[PDB]
Amino acid sequence: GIVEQCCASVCSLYQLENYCN
Amino acid sequence: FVNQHLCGSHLVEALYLVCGERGFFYTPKA
C-alpha cells in the first residue's frame, strides 16, 4: 500500500499517480 | 520532489501537488 511503497521505501511518480482520482 | 521517502503529512502534500484538481485518495492502512 502507499505507506510501504512511498514512506518505508522510495516513492515514484508512477506510484503516486495511481492514487489520483 | 516525488522520488524520495514521503511519510505522513509529507506524503499527503506530494499527493496534493501531483494530483491537482483530480484530488486523490490516501489509504495508509490498506
Swiss-Prot record, chain A:
Originating species: Bos taurus (Bovine)
Protein name listed in UniProt: Insulin A chain
Portion held of the full protein: 85 to 105 of 105
Gene behind the chain: INS
Disulfide bonds: C6-C11
Domain of life of the source: Eukaryota
